[PDB]
From Swiss-Prot:
Domain writeup: The cysteine framework is I (CC-C-C). Alpha4/3 pattern.
Cysteine amide: residues carrying this PTM: 12
UniProt-annotated location(s): Secreted
Name of this protein: Alpha-conotoxin ImI
Assigned GO CC terms: extracellular region; host cell postsynaptic membrane
Organism: Conus imperialis (Imperial cone)
Molecular function terms, GO-annotated: acetylcholine receptor inhibitor activity; ion channel regulator activity; toxin activity
Included range, full protein: 5 to 16 of 17
S-S bonds: 2-8, 2-12, 3-8, 3-12
Tissue spec: Expressed by the venom duct.
Impact noted for substituting residue 5 to L: Reduction of toxicity
Remaining remarks: This toxin is a substrate for a multienzyme complex that regulates its folding and assembly. This complex is composed of protein-disulfide isomerase (PDI), peptidyl-prolyl cis-trans isomerase (PPI) and immunoglobulin-binding protein (BiP). PDI catalyzes the oxidation and reduction of disulfide bonds. Oxidative folding rates are further increased in the presence of PPI with the maximum effect observed in the presence of both enzymes. In contrast, BiP is only observed to assist folding in the presence of microsomes, suggesting that additional cofactors are involved.
Site, Important for binding to human alpha-7 nAChR: residue positions: 5-7, 9-10
Function of the protein: Alpha-conotoxins act on postsynaptic membranes, they bind to the nicotinic acetylcholine receptors (nAChR) and thus inhibit them. This toxin blocks neuronal alpha-3-beta-2/CHRNA3-CHRNB2 (human and rat), alpha-7/CHRNA7 (human and rat), and alpha-3-beta-4/CHRNA3-CHRNB4 (human) nAChRs. Acts voltage-independently. Competes with alpha-bungarotoxin for binding to the receptor. Binds to a different site than alpha-conotoxin ImII. Is highly active against the neuromuscular receptor in frog. Also exhibits inhibition of D.melanogaster alpha-7 nAChRs.
Length: 12
């Protein structure tokens, strides 16, 4: 899930 990617950590 996106939250592992710090470039996808937003809202996560």
């Amino acid at each position: 899930g996106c939250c592992s990617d710090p470039r996808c950590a937003w809202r996560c």
